């Protein structure tokens, strides 16, 4: 719905640590794992990275 509470402007999205931040340093939550905004990441067979909040996996 259209709820009531404490938000912050649209350019800013919420961080875990009480502040809200732009989507530049908005981490990824891949498989639960809280990856930092720049974490290149791969097993032998996959290839994955966190860009701006979304987790860009390939194969």
């Amino acid at each position: 719905a259209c709820l009531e509470g404490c938000f912050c402007p649209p350019g800013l999205y919420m961080d875990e640590r009480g502040d809200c931040v732009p989507k530049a340093q908005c981490p990824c939550y891949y498989d639960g794992e809280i990856f930092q905004p720049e974490d290149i990441f791969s097993d032998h067979h996959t290839m994955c990275y966190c860009e701006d909040g979304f987790m860009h996996c390939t194969m």
Binding site: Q36, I40, F41
Partner: protein, 164 residues
């Protein structure tokens, strides 16, 4: 270390004490706790104060009790930047056959997960304590013969007492 001390003094290494008598420091030989260490990219330290490096990408064992099976630790390594010579630690797994044969998992943040379930810190079960240290780093403590440290960005430590 290139400086003099009078006789009868007792300087103390971290391990034990030593006393000067007739230009000959006497010393004890009682064991003192070891520290395996992982940090940086792939730089290890053994309990016996060795250093080396091994940039493998799989789930490797790190430590284990090997005459009985009180515990077992398992690191997991991944490439961690564009280069091939950059293999940082992502997550470490811990296992306690003495309590449910559970399965703890330190994750790439400051988070922990028991048997898939995320958990708020602290976590006083019977033996093992898990709590923040500076509110930026986890610290497991099973019994009095085991410690750990954060595996978020990969600076795993241990503390084993001489019972092992």
């Amino acid at each position: 270390s290139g400086k003099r001390y009078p006789p009868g003094t007792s300087l103390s290494r971290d391990c034990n004490t030593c006393i000067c008598r007739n230009s000959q420091w006497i010393c004890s030989n009682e064991e003192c706790p070891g520290e395996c260490l992982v940090t940086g990219q792939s730089h290890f330290k053994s309990f016996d104060n060795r250093y080396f490096t091994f940039s493998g990408i799989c789930q490797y064992l790190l430590a284990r009790d090997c005459q009985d099976h009180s515990f077992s630790i398992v690191i997991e390594t991944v490439q961690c930047a564009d280069d091939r010579d950059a293999v940082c630690t992502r997550s470490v797994t811990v296992r306690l056959p003495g309590l449910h044969n559970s399965l703890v998992k330190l994750k790439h943040g400051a988070g922990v997960a028991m048997d898939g379930q995320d958990v708020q810190l602290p976590l006083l079960k019977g033996d093992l304590r898990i709590q923040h240290t500076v509110t930026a780093s986890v610290r497991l403590s099973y019994g009095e013969d085991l410690q750990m440290d954060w595996d978020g960005r990969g600076r795993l430590l241990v503390k084993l007492s001489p019972v092992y």
